[PDB]
């Protein structure tokens with residue numbers, strides 16, 4: 354566990370249960386009944402709940418757990434992941450963190466992933482024994498303190514521009530590099546922490562594209578048989 | 580349109596409406612009513628319809644349109660895609676092909692993607708004018724004939740092993756390389772066509788991982804500013 358590994362954090366992620374402010378908003382009471390589930394237990398999904406986000410703070414960019422799903426499928430199925438060179442974390446917009454054991458097999462299917470997140474939020478850890486997924490209250494800085502990396506990079510379209518190849522080379526110079534990607538569809542980080550801002554392209558990309566650029570460029574430096 | 584572009588085909592994809600053999604299987608009649616939609620119009624989804632696949636031919640690996648969703652999000656949001664160096668196609672297990680205009684913005688959300696596929700299957704082309712998506716009856720060989728590539732690679736765990744970096748270099752030697760990835764969760768291709776079998780790793784990976792390895796390795800050779 355002192356070999357070189359990438360520590361990847363999907364941060365300020367739009368992954369949360371229905372906000373308390375809107376639990377009795379019409380579109381929420383009817384979704385909830387239709388699914389025969391208590392509205393507070395349900396994961397906010399902007400696709401279904403769009404008419405209830407209008408007056409919510411930051412409503413336009415909330416309830417996007419699809420971003421997390423696709424980022425996690427990309428990361429957990431990576432060659433980098435199978436070679437024991439990745440640790441991945443989710444930090445949510447409400448300052449909770451989800452820890453993920455490397456061997457975790459996320460549902461490929463979005464609605465099963467949703468099901469699984471509802472369980473994780475309810476019980477704090479899934480499954481009961483393994484705690485392959487484990488959630489707790491935590492800020493981004495508190496998480497970074499635990500990881501105790503030797504460098505922190507923050508992926509930002511407006512940071513120092515790098516060729517992805519070259520960013521992979523750069524990450525391979527550290528022992529315990531941490532890379533942070535926003536889990537939100539647009540705008541800026543909410544959680545300002547210390548680190549180097551890196552752009553991989555001079556237009557905005559989606560989080561999972563960035564996850565891929567970083568993971569694949571790092572594989573080719575760090576996996577010795579490559 | 581005679582610059583170097585990758586032509587990527589997700590093939591024998593498990594993307595189809597409910598099979599005629601099971602349209603009046605219980606789990607299908609009740610799903611269908613619950614959604615107030617005619618069962619033949621609905622996309623087969625093994626997550627919901629698992630009890631109806633038991634006796635279907637190949638039932639175990641059918642109704643996996645999530646694989647296509649995640650492969651297409653990876654491909655269409657790629658840097659390679661934004662640089663006009665990618666054309667992507669879906670070939671389904673029933674010998675239909677979906678053509679995709681580069682500028683297409685797939686729903687990030689799985690259930691909207693499903694919605695969109697139901698429309699595409701019904702009308703043959705979406706939206707009415709743009710035909711950003713367009714479907715028609717076609718075998719894999721018929722599709723390859725149209726593309727008229729100068730080389731065809733078939734991604735196979737048991738093919739000639741290559742370092743992804745090196746496979747990118749290889750693809751960059753051709754004008755119009757075609758790469759084929761299976762859109763099925765396990766097993767072999769159904770559609771045997773002529774081409775070079777390439778493994779990128781000596782264990783089985785998921786289609787979207789392979790899509791990423793290929794697309795990212797090609798970007799770094801073919802985009803000159805990289």
Ligand SMILES: CSC[C@H]1O[C@@H](n2cnc3c(N)ncnc32)[C@H](O)[C@@H]1O
Pocket residue numbers: 507508509510511533534535536537538539540541542551552553554555556557558559560563
């Ligand atoms: C708002 S898009 C989601 C996240 O993707 C990352 N991102 C988006 N575009 C780029 C880019 N061009 N370079 C680097 N990171 C990016 C950032 O970490 C952002 O929070």
Ligand SMILES: CSC[C@H]1O[C@@H](n2cnc3c(N)ncnc32)[C@H](O)[C@@H]1O
Pocket residue numbers: 733734735736737759760761762763764765766767768777778779780781782783784785786789
């Ligand atoms: C059955 S997994 C889906 C598809 O992924 C591709 N694939 C899976 N594992 C590998 C691998 N190790 N190397 C190359 N292609 C692979 C093949 O094209 C397959 O049809």
Ligand SMILES: [Cl-]
Pocket residue numbers: 356357
């Ligand atoms: Cl090492």
Ligand SMILES: [Cl-]
Pocket residue numbers: 582583
């Ligand atoms: Cl060119």
